[PDB]
Amino acid sequence: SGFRKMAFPSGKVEGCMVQVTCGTTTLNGLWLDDVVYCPRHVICTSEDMLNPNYEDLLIRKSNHNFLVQAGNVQLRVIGHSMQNCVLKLKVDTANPKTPKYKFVRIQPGQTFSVLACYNGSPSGVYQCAMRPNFTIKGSFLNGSCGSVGFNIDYDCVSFCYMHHMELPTGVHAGTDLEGNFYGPFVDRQTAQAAGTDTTITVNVLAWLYAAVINGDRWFLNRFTTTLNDFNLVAMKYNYEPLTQDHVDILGPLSAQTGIAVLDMCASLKELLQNGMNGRTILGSALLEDEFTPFDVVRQCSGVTF
Amino acid sequence: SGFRKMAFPSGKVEGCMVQVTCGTTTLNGLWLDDVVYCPRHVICTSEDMLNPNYEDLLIRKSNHNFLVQAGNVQLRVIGHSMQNCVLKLKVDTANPKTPKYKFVRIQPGQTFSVLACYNGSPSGVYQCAMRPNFTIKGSFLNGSCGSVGFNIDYDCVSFCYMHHMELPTGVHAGTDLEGNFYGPFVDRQTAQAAGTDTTITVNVLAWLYAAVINGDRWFLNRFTTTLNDFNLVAMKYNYEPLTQDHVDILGPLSAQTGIAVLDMCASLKELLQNGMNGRTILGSALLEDEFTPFDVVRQCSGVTF
Numbered sequence: 001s002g003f004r005k006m007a008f009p010s011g012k013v014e015g016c017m018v019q020v021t022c023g024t025t026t027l028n029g030l031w032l033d034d035v036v037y038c039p040r041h042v043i044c045t046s047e048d049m050l051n052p053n054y055e056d057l058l059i060r061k062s063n064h065n066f067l068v069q070a071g072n073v074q075l076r077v078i079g080h081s082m083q084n085c086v087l088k089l090k091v092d093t094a095n096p097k098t099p100k101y102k103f104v105r106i107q108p109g110q111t112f113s114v115l116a117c118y119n120g121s122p123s124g125v126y127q128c129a130m131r132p133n134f135t136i137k138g139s140f141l142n143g144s145c146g147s148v149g150f151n152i153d154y155d156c157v158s159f160c161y162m163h164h165m166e167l168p169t170g171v172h173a174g175t176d177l178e179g180n181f182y183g184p185f186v187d188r189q190t191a192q193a194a195g196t197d198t199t200i201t202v203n204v205l206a207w208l209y210a211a212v213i214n215g216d217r218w219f220l221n222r223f224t225t226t227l228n229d230f231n232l233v234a235m236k237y238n239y240e241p242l243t244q245d246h247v248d249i250l251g252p253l254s255a256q257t258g259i260a261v262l263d264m265c266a267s268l269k270e271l272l273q274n275g276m277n278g279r280t281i282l283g284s285a286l287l288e289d290e291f292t293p294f295d296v297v298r299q300c301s302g303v304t305f
Numbered sequence: 306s307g308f309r310k311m312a313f314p315s316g317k318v319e320g321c322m323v324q325v326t327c328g329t330t331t332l333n334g335l336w337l338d339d340v341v342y343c344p345r346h347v348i349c350t351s352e353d354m355l356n357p358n359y360e361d362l363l364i365r366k367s368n369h370n371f372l373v374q375a376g377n378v379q380l381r382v383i384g385h386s387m388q389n390c391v392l393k394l395k396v397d398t399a400n401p402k403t404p405k406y407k408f409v410r411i412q413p414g415q416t417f418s419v420l421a422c423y424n425g426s427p428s429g430v431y432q433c434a435m436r437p438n439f440t441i442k443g444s445f446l447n448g449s450c451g452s453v454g455f456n457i458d459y460d461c462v463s464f465c466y467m468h469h470m471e472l473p474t475g476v477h478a479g480t481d482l483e484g485n486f487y488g489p490f491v492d493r494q495t496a497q498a499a500g501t502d503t504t505i506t507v508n509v510l511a512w513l514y515a516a517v518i519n520g521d522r523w524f525l526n527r528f529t530t531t532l533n534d535f536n537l538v539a540m541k542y543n544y545e546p547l548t549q550d551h552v553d554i555l556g557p558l559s560a561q562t563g564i565a566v567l568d569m570c571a572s573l574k575e576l577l578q579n580g581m582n583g584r585t586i587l588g589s590a591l592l593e594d595e596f597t598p599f600d601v602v603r604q605c606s607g608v609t610f
């Protein structure tokens with residue numbers, strides 16, 4: 001009983017974090033096998049960040065200019081290359097703590113854990129979602145770049161995010177581990193604005209299922225709806241449109257609870273139109289959208305790693 | 306920028322989790338040096354839990370009846386003893402992953418991270434507070450007993466909680482690592498009710514400081530108050546009384562922001578009397594009370610471990 005915003009256990013990723021310094025800039029790197037991955041903006045001065053030419057800046061850099069430290073211990077850099085917006089630093093030692101891993105590019109609405117790091121050392125772990133506008137709402141200060149986001153499946157870490165940027169509005173932008181930004185963002189200190197941050201409808205529904213499984217049932221009503229009728233209301237409240245693909249993914253929660261997905265949609269429609277009237281669901285006064293249907297099943301069934 | 310409910314990195318504690326089985330009951334143990342700590346109710350059948358005599362049940366148990374497994378590998382039990390509500394199982398091997406550690410008994414209002422485990426394996430990590438009624442609001446299923454709560458100071462783990470019980474209301478009870486329950490709870494399946502769950506006022510104020518540091522300032526008003534005047538309002542809204550000790554602990558946040566503690570109290574008084582009028586603070590529609598003043602300073606300054 002109870003339902004919490006839960007992060008994956010961080011130990012497998014803690015063993016991969018290193019410090020990368022180029023000139024006067026220090027941030028974090030990810031050490032997997034004999035490669036260290038980090039944001040390419042490690043090479044930029046404060047002048048440089050305003051309008052950087054990364055290919056031209058990288059000409060003036062050699063292997064020995066990239067200082068990589070794993071705990072108390074210096075790694076030897078034997079190659080470097082740029083892939084999109086990340087640098088790959090080849091080192092002479094394979095990380096002995098390298099977990100089974102994959103690089104995945106996630107979809108908007110997918111969740112992941114962030115291990116926020118400074119100087120190659122972990123500060124804390126929390127759960128994030130990739131927003132529909134391809135930002136994340138993190139907790140990141142200067143020096144946090146190269147911190148990563150991940151999911152675990154038993155013993156295999158799927159890395160999906162590396163932190164690069166804070167926008168002027170205080171939301172966060174970054175890349176997959178191939179160095180491709182999520183969304184239209186660029187690694188330059190220029191005004192970039194995010195688009196509409198819509199609510200992840202399929203995740204809200206999953207969390208309403210989690211609420212029913214935990215005895216918070218006050219919001220269940222006498223109504224049903226259709227995908228087209230629900231979606232007219234979703235559009236008005238800046239919710240993502242629900243598709244049959246989303247209905248299919250919610251099937252196991254529907255089967256466990258005996259509440260038809262379109263019935264839960266009609267409960268959600270009423271909460272949008274009426275508000276919460278000062279009541280809470282699973283200790284929240286807002287509809288929570290950073291749990292996926294997979295997250296709710298995992299937490300409600302006690303899946304381990 | 307941004308502010309998140311952040312857990313400590315879990316790796317140091319992941320290395321200490323084991324599985325303990327007695328008869329048909331399996332739960333989690335904490336392996337530090339050559340001792341495994343676990344809830345004494347590991348020895349109880351389902352009949353037994355209704356009215357257990359732990360001393361009498363333990364007479365029928367020998368070292369070889371306690372099955373301890375660390376990953377794929379069986380530990381040899383060479384002694385056992387009961388201390389309050391925990392068993393201490395002496396094993397023939399010191400845990401090679403034993404971190405620097407301490408056992409601490411926390412005060413109500415203090416926060417900690419929980420590593421929720423099943424079968425000795427980690428499921429997830431989240432942040433909790435010790436409530437003023439000495440319950441916690443966790444996420445725990447059957448098999449989660451022996452999961453622990455902890456804080457880290459650089460490289461030293463302070464264990465403060467071991468999970469034992471779910472109350473009929475779905476809140477959680479457990480012990481320190483000396484086996485003394487927090488609150489009046491007992492390790493018996495009998496109806497136990499929690500007292501009033503009051504709000505941790507000093508933590509709400511800390512979070513309002515975190516909000517100002519992050520640019521969420523709409524709630525700051527033109528008023529001040531006194532400790533006695535604020536406390537009349539606190540009592541009416543089931544908030545804990547504020548003491549000068551709490552005012553002193555909030556000093557560094559007051560100094561950083563230039564907002565006098567009693568001024569922030571007057572802002573909080575207005576939020577209690579007026580509500581949020583459908584607005585949010587740091588993405589919450591409720592006043593959050595599970596960040597300590599220490600937690601806010603740590604997160605806002607990027608402290609690592």
Ligand SMILES: *C(=S)NCc1cccnc1
Nearest residue numbers: 140141142143144145166
């Ligand atoms: C990374 S080392 N620097 C950019 C930045 C600053 C603050 C928050 N997020 C990213």
Ligand SMILES: *C(=S)NCc1cccnc1
Nearest residue numbers: 445446447448449450471
């Ligand atoms: C521990 S193994 N069993 C008791 C229990 C059950 C559910 C949640 N919390 C504790």
Ligand code: NA
Nearest residue numbers: 115117147148
């Ligand atoms: Na990280």
Ligand code: NA
Nearest residue numbers: 134173174182
């Ligand atoms: Na992004």
Ligand code: NA
Nearest residue numbers: 203289290291
């Ligand atoms: Na959700």
Ligand code: NA
Nearest residue numbers: 420422452453
């Ligand atoms: Na634990």
Ligand code: NA
Nearest residue numbers: 439478479487
């Ligand atoms: Na307790």
Ligand code: NA
Nearest residue numbers: 508594595596
């Ligand atoms: Na708080």
